[PDB]
Symmetry: D2
Subunit: 115 residues, 4 copies
């Protein structure tokens, strides 16, 4: 499992559950092609988006639907989504854990990259 | 002006100076239409991006070129750039300060919205 | 003045107004000696805490009463307060802006140090 | 395991390994009494600090020695340490995961509290 995304709710101090996200990969013609998608579990984690073989070198974008998350909780947030755009595997295969920490008017994203 | 961006460097403890960014407005065909850009001053701030009359309701994107900033400092970054996407003015005109706090493998974006 | 504190509210997307804080300097017996305090203005800023002549080298602590802030908004917070502890002026006099970004179950503190 | 602390390095995008921390509990006479201590593992996690039985209601402080971490990597950071001060178990036993995200001039702390 070379790509994992974890999402936390900084208002409730809890995992952000059932958060939808879509992953895209930049194609040769410079457009965003749909790569993978899923929803966070009860632990706020989304595993199994891709495989070592499929997750080749490229520029990837993860668009996390934070607006729907907040709206469902009664909140009109600032951001439409939280985005992570990154070049992956440019020095060989790596494991990526993307952490998103959510507040109604602020988010942070962090990457932990391991061998 | 109704939009200001401030950028800070969490490695050096300083304003992030000469950081380039482009501002886009989502078009009817939902492509992104560029409409403003600039680079942060010596105080890490970018003002004068738009005016009250131009800054109408819509979905806006600020694309901050964080990668080039880290490149210039000789530090390996994770993200291609830092994309702040938000619906503007949804209630009516507001003043927006977008604050971006940068680290090589993490960033946060916060909005301060005043009326 | 050589020390300024700015506080932002990540739930409301606003300056955090009327946030109380105390500043301490570590004494010889390594107890904390209070020496300044105040509350954030309507811009979320607290200025005039000290002067260039008073702000000598040493270890300083800013104790931000985040709990009372969240209490006043009717929101359950995690932390008792947000303690910024730093060695000042270690090279010589600097100007410090401490920026605190607050959520109920998360906070970040960043220093902008200029010379 | 009712208390866990995880520490990440936002410069390298990696767990922050061998980071020392000390936990204190506020006594009846309002002083800080030593409660527990340890170092983060290769995963940047510190488990086993306490037990359900021992971890009674109280005000707890975790002081994470971030300065030694950065110094060992050649960096003179802003903060002396990262602190987490919180009331625990005031509504019955809870599980606490404290996440610290470290940069030389900035840190964030987040709590995930579960049943």
């Amino acid at each position: 499992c070379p790509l994992m995304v974890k999402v936390l709710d900084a208002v409730r101090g809890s995992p952000a559950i059932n958060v939808a996200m879509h992953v895209f990969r930049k194609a040769a013609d410079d457009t965003w092609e749909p790569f993978a998608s899923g929803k966070t579990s009860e632990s706020g984690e989304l595993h199994g988006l891709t495989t070592e073989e499929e997750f080749v070198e490229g520029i990837y974008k993860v668009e996390i639907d934070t607006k729907s998350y907040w709206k469902a909780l009664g909140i009109s947030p600032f951001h439409e989504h939280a985005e992570v755009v990154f070049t992956a595997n440019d020095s060989g295969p790596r494991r990526y854990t993307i952490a998103a920490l959510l507040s109604p008017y602020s988010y942070s994203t962090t990457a932990v990259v391991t061998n």
